[PDB]
């Protein structure tokens, strides 16, 4: 593994969110700025196949401070605390190159009025639904068209702080200000059903959280679990959310990112004739500004929690192929962790993840 730390030339601005979409890692933040880097350019620089002086975003444009970015190969969903835009046609489908903003179609999808604020935006590509969490309801919109499908109303005392996508598309999970984990069954139509309410389970702080569950959808990770002062823990979605493993004790009140790699890896132990399949989690250790990468099978870190930033990590995103981790903080420095086969082994075909979901 190589760590490339690349200070951004963005003056006094801040990057709050990022997303790996298509060939790009897309950064977005204050002043409405969006900047797109080719993932492979950063990886190639990390392995010295190209030089550092050539690094530069392929496309930058300006949309309010941006806190949310998600989407697919046809639409970027870009959100402030009060507005959500859709930028469609952002990727030239014939060349796999990002278009300039001048070829992009942009639409104001949603606006809320203070005191309301958007606490999270999550996109479930299998349901075809975007979830907009507001401080107190969850709104369900059809993707692209953005027709309103339904609305989940929850208690006045329960602010929905963050949402967690189910890779199988059967559920949506919310963590609340009054310490609950709420699990809803969701249908593609937008109809919904509360199926699990776990109370006094998590301590949420007034932050934008970035949490993803395991690609097999069997583990829900929790920052600041107050079951099993507080710790980062893994809950078994198939065994009544029992704690299966604790990763960090104590967790930091400033930790807001815990994301699984989408890959399911197999690494042989050739000397002993055996092999191990495992998942990877990126989060922080007890100190803000650390990055910890955790092998869920060995239940060990890949390396000592590494102090990379003087400030809390704002967001992290794995590459789609599982071999690169991108991270950003208020230090305005893009962190690229570029793994190799000799580090991790081989990402398994999606058949193997799909078999474990069923």
């Amino acid at each position: 593994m190589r760590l490339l730390k690349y200070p951004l030339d963005i003056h006094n601005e801040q990057v709050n969110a990022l997303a790996a979409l298509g060939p790009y890692i897309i950064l977005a933040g204050s002043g409405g700025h969006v900047m797109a880097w080719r993932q492979q350019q950063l990886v190639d620089t990390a392995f010295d196949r190209v030089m550092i002086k050539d690094l530069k975003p392929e496309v930058s444009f300006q949309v309010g401070d941006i806190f949310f970015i998600t989407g697919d190969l046809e639409t970027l969903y870009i959100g402030s605390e009060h507005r959500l835009w859709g930028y469609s046609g952002w990727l030239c489908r014939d060349t796999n190159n990002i278009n300039s903003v001048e070829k992009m179609n942009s639409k104001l999808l949603f606006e809320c009025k203070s005191p309301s604020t958007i606490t999270d935006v999550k996109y479930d590509i299998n349901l075809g639904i975007l979830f907009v969490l507001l401080s107190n309801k969850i709104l369900l919109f059809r993707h692209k068209t953005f027709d309103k499908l339904s609305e989940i109303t929850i208690d006045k005392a329960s602010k929905p702080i963050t949402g967690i996508i189910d890779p199988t598309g059967q559920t949506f999970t919310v963590m609340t200000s009054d310490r609950s984990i709420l699990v809803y069954q969701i249908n593609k139509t937008g109809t919904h059903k509360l199926i699990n309410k776990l109370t006094q389970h998590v301590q949420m702080y007034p932050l934008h959280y970035r949490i993803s569950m395991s690609p097999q959808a069997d583990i829900l990770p929790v920052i600041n679990s107050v079951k099993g002062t507080s710790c980062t823990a893994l809950l078994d979605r198939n065994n009544n959310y029992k704690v299966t493993k604790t990763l960090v004790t104590p967790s930091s009140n400033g930790c807001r990112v815990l994301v699984y790699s989408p890959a399911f890896y197999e690494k042989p132990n050739l000397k002993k004739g055996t092999s191990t399949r495992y998942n990877l989690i990126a989060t922080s250790g007890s100190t803000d500004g650390t990055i910890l990468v955790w092998n869920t099978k060995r239940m060990k870190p890949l390396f000592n929690a590494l102090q990379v930033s003087s400030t809390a990590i704002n967001d992290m995103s794995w590459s789609q192929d599982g071999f690169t981790l991108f991270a950003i903080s208020n230090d305005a420095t893009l962190y690229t962790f570029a793994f190799q086969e000799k580090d991790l082994g081989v990402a398994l075909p999606q058949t193997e993840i799909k078999s474990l979901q069923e």
Binding site: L3, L302, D343
Partner: peptide, 11 residues
């Protein structure tokens, strides 16, 4: 401001 590029050995 210059980039840092470091090798990080794994366990």
């Amino acid at each position: 401001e210059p980039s840092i590029l470091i090798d990080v050995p794994l366990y």
